[PDB]
Design a protein around this ligand. Sequence first.
Ligand SMILES: N[C@@H]1c2ccccc2CC12CCN(c1nc3ncc(Sc4cccnc4C(F)(F)F)nc3[nH]1)CC2
Length: 504
Amino acid sequence: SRRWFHPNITGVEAENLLLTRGVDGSFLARPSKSNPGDFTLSVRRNGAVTHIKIQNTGDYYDLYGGEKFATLAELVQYYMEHHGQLKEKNGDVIELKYPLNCADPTSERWFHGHLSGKEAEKLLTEKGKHGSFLVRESQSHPGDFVLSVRTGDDKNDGKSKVTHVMIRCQELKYDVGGGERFDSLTDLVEHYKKNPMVETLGTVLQLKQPLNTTRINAAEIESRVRELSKLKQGFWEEFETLQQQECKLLYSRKEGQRQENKNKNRYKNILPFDHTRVVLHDGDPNEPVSDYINANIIMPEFKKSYIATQGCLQNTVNDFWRMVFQENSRVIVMTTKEVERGKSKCVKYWPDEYALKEYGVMRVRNVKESAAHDYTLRELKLSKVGQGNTERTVWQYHFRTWPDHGVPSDPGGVLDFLEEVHHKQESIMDAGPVVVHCSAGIGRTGTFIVIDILIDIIREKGVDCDIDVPKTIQMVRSQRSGMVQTEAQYRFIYMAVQHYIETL
Ligand SMILES: N[C@@H]1c2ccccc2CC12CCN(c1nc3ncc(Sc4cccnc4C(F)(F)F)nc3[nH]1)CC2
């Protein structure tokens, strides 16, 4: 869990935490009470607290007077490992040394607050499986807690059971009636996750996973949207709770950090994970490194795969077409304009209609453009220079109407677009991964990919099937940093899936 992130504290509270429990170099992060997307990094230095604003407008986290990042945990990791980079306006170095840990259990996935033993039994009996657990406040003994764990065989009939374990709070510390006394509920839970309790007759109280509360029956998505809309809101809690799981996803991005690739990244610290990056072959032996593009393979796991990538730079257009060729991709989804709010988001990597251009070893002909309301389709022919028999059609679906701020007011445009993309891809035997990009290749790109993954479950299984939006996003975020950036995008995913279901 992301311990240095304190949900539901004020600025004044943050200052006092850092002044009373911190030292110089201690820091924490916190969200705005009013605004999803606004965050503050609070840092103790020279016996005082400095607050630094962070904003997410949908494409990345933007640290004021600092750099752009895919996640707050990648931001924190960066400044803890690169001394001198975070600076005050007058030049003075702001050091992030010591994460100040949140002791408040409220945001933990396993924490259920005021919840009865009867209610906890019902939740575990209906939704739980072997090793599902939760912690709740004791009704009998104020300040105490109860750990409730389901154990059994998952293949009803007494083969499973719920066990309740009392957690005492004695003199500011937590225990289970013996052994170690913990400074927080979190420390206690983490210890008994690693070191399971055993009953008198041998049952191991395995804390395998927090009770799942977010999985739904897809046909009931409207009721879940209603529930998540209740007022801050359910949607915000859910997206934040998911965000608290991002420290499990700090996978190496060593290749993207190499000096030989520094000019190949649109944003210096938004990098592909090494374990999923697209590796480019047959490269120019004269180039110091020719195997790198800022792109990751996204494979759903619980047929069709994706390449999530950034908007091309002038110097990466040739690499982009090498990738498209190598991976046998026949469909590109572009979800940005070239220029938005005065800023270039993607260089034009395609020729004008009816024109032919060479891009290094590759050539692309733009055969025909077809303009719909929300998108333009460009029928491109890609081939290797010298080898006409390598020609294949690449269909570029360019979504034009995504708003400059926030998300579209309805999902119909995105749904229609994604339906055309899906059918084109499905019609081409042996097509490779669908290439998807925006500007940084994480916010909108993540949103379109996750929508597509969830819709495809419904295509296969019908509307009577389980879907789990945050679970799916965590799986995609394990393959490219920070996929799905904002709460507005998260709500839009639910909106798109709901309206897919409603138009069957
Ligand atoms: N602590 C909360 C509280 C406070 C006072 C009173 C009651 C309650 C319940 C409480 C916890 C349980 N609820 C909850 N919401 C969530 N949203 C996203 C996620 S992430 C997820 C989901 C599914 C699978 N895999 C992941 C992964 F970890 F891999 F990302 N998990 C969630 N769990 C509802 C909110």
